[PDB]
Design an enzyme around this catalytic site. Structure first.
Site, short mmCIF file in Angstrom:
data_model
loop_
_atom_site.label_atom_id
_atom_site.label_comp_id
_atom_site.label_asym_id
_atom_site.label_seq_id
_atom_site.Cartn_x
_atom_site.Cartn_y
_atom_site.Cartn_z
N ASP A 1 -113.05 103.30 52.73
CA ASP A 1 -113.80 102.50 51.77
C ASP A 1 -112.94 102.13 50.56
OD1 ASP A 1 -116.08 101.10 51.02
OD2 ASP A 1 -117.13 102.84 50.18
N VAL B 1 -118.64 106.91 33.29
CA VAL B 1 -117.30 107.10 32.75
C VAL B 1 -117.13 106.48 31.37
CG1 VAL B 1 -114.84 107.03 33.36
CG2 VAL B 1 -116.56 106.87 35.17
C1 LIG Z 1 -115.13 93.12 40.56
C2 LIG Z 1 -115.72 94.22 39.70
C3 LIG Z 1 -115.30 94.05 38.26
O1 LIG Z 1 -114.84 92.99 37.86
N1 LIG Z 1 -115.48 95.15 37.46
C4 LIG Z 1 -114.89 95.20 36.17
C5 LIG Z 1 -114.61 94.07 35.38
C6 LIG Z 1 -114.02 94.19 34.13
C7 LIG Z 1 -113.77 95.47 33.62
C8 LIG Z 1 -114.07 96.60 34.38
C9 LIG Z 1 -113.76 97.96 33.85
O2 LIG Z 1 -114.03 98.28 32.71
N2 LIG Z 1 -113.19 98.83 34.75
C10 LIG Z 1 -112.34 99.83 34.23
C11 LIG Z 1 -112.20 100.96 35.01
C12 LIG Z 1 -111.30 101.95 34.64
C13 LIG Z 1 -110.52 101.86 33.47
N3 LIG Z 1 -109.62 102.93 33.14
C14 LIG Z 1 -109.83 104.14 33.86
N4 LIG Z 1 -108.90 105.13 33.78
C15 LIG Z 1 -109.05 106.28 34.46
C16 LIG Z 1 -110.20 106.51 35.22
C17 LIG Z 1 -111.17 105.52 35.25
C18 LIG Z 1 -112.39 105.67 36.07
C19 LIG Z 1 -112.62 106.84 36.78
C20 LIG Z 1 -113.76 106.87 37.58
C21 LIG Z 1 -114.63 105.78 37.68
N5 LIG Z 1 -114.38 104.66 36.99
C22 LIG Z 1 -113.29 104.60 36.22
N6 LIG Z 1 -110.96 104.37 34.57
C23 LIG Z 1 -110.62 100.68 32.72
C24 LIG Z 1 -111.52 99.66 33.10
C25 LIG Z 1 -114.60 96.46 35.66
C26 LIG Z 1 -115.74 93.25 41.95
N7 LIG Z 1 -114.83 92.70 42.97
C27 LIG Z 1 -114.63 93.70 44.01
C28 LIG Z 1 -115.38 91.46 43.52
#
Ligand SMILES: *[C@H](CC(=O)Nc1cccc(C(=O)Nc2ccc(Nc3nccc(-c4cccnc4)n3)cc2)c1)CN(C)C
Length: 349
Positions: A145, A34
């Site tokens: 999940d 993504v």
């Molecule tokens: C914690 C896991 C963890 O900390 N992961 C993490 C840390 C810091 C930043 C990010 C990160 O960048 N995640 C994202 C995800 C999404 C978005 N914005 C978004 N908009 C629409 C669609 C999507 C998308 C679609 C499909 C798949 N992924 C994303 N994203 C911004 C930032 C992640 C673990 N704990 C469970 C312990």
């Protein structure tokens, strides 16, 4: 490639429509490839997901078909919506990639969960979760999940569920983060709709603690963390287990379990007075009803939405919205047959 152009984003080749510009990686993994981009046609920021090897196997193809069909049919403010879908390949023969275009959210629940939350923001996030989960259940979709990485939020605190989990299947079975899976899923007992309530309880507890409730290298280690904190389940529950897993579960040392005041002390909650005092006990009470091993004693989605901690946000227009109708979702096919089913979905949209 006339309306398409290529760009390497986060060690991955993105062959996208010329309308999507300033592509930026939005970094994580597991699910999926993504990035963020600006849609020139709509004058809005979007998220483009390139499906990772959709025809590697039947599980990838079934999950891809399921996600593409459900993202299209579902139209709820707390479930991510499909703005667009395309393939740079011109024919079924050449067809190999799928690009899902959805609304860009600011952060993942995994980062928001680590923030100091006020009861207003916290109850609102849980309200939206329960709204989305309610909407999925109405259509017969039991996620099984739900996890912070599967949930995204916006700056205005609006929340959306990314995934559909095992969706329309009839047996809790997957196969990297298992800390949110309900005991009945782990121990393979069968499930009902409140299986997703355990995951909400795990997420809420984590918002309060700022630490994963039930960490562990594996399920064996994870189950210890569950019994140490919540106590050993009733003989009635352990009777409902299979003789082989039952043998291990019953042979574990017996735990009374820490009370919810000890599990979630007032120290973890905003202090001093009067609204914050009221809200600490209401939040703890909802946790004591969601974080229950026995699903026969765990609160439902409907009753959770009726709880004083959540009910402050209750809006019949958001909660009692009409369920999505229907393609179908439990029949097996060859990888070639999934490819054609997936190709027709991408083309007819
Ligand atoms: C914690 C896991 C963890 O900390 N992961 C993490 C840390 C810091 C930043 C990010 C990160 O960048 N995640 C994202 C995800 C999404 C978005 N914005 C978004 N908009 C629409 C669609 C999507 C998308 C679609 C499909 C798949 N992924 C994303 N994203 C911004 C930032 C992640 C673990 N704990 C469970 C312990």
């Amino acid at each position: 490639d006339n309306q398409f152009y290529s760009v390497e984003v986060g060690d991955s080749t993105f062959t996208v429509l010329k309308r999507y510009q300033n592509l930026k990686p939005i970094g994580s993994g597991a699910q999926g490839i993504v990035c963020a981009a600006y849609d020139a046609v709509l004058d809005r920021n979007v998220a483009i997901k390139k499906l990772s090897r959709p025809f590697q196997n039947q599980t990838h193809a079934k999950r891809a078909y399921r996600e593409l069909v459900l993202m299209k049919c579902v139209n709820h403010k707390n479930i991510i919506s499909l703005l667009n879908v395309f393939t740079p390949q011109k024919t079924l023969e050449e067809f190999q990639d799928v690009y899902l275009v959805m609304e860009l959210m600011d952060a993942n629940l995994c980062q928001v969960i680590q923030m100091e939350l006020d009861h207003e923001r916290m109850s609102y996030l849980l309200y939206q979760m329960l709204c989305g989960i309610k909407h999925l259940h109405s259509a017969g979709i039991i996620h099984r999940d739900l996890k912070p990485s599967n949930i995204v939020v916006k700056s205005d605190c609006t929340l959306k569920i990314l995934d559909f989990g095992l969706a329309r299947t009839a047996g809790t079975s997957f196969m990297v983060t298992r800390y949110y899976r309900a005991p009945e899923v782990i121990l393979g007992m069968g499930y009902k709709e409140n299986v997703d309530i355990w995951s909400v309880g795990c997420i809420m507890g984590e918002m309060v603690r700022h630490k994963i409730l039930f960490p562990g290298r594996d399920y064996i280690d994870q189950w210890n963390k569950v019994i140490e904190q919540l106590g050993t389940p009733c003989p009635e529950f352990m009777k409902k287990l299979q003789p082989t897993v039952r043998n291990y579960v019953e042979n574990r040392p017996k735990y009374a379990g820490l009370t919810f005041p000890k599990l979630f002390p007032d120290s973890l909650f905003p202090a001093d007075s009067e609204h914050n005092k009221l809200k600490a006990s209401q939040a703890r009470d909802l946790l004591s009803k969601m974080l229950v091993i026995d699903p026969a004693k765990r609160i439902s989605v409907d009753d959770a939405l009726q709880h004083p901690y959540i009910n402050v946000w209750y809006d019949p227009a958001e909660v009692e919205a009409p369920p999505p109708q229907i393609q179908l979702d439990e029949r097996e096919h060859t990888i070639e047959e999934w490819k054609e089913l997936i190709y027709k979905e991408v083309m007819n949209s």
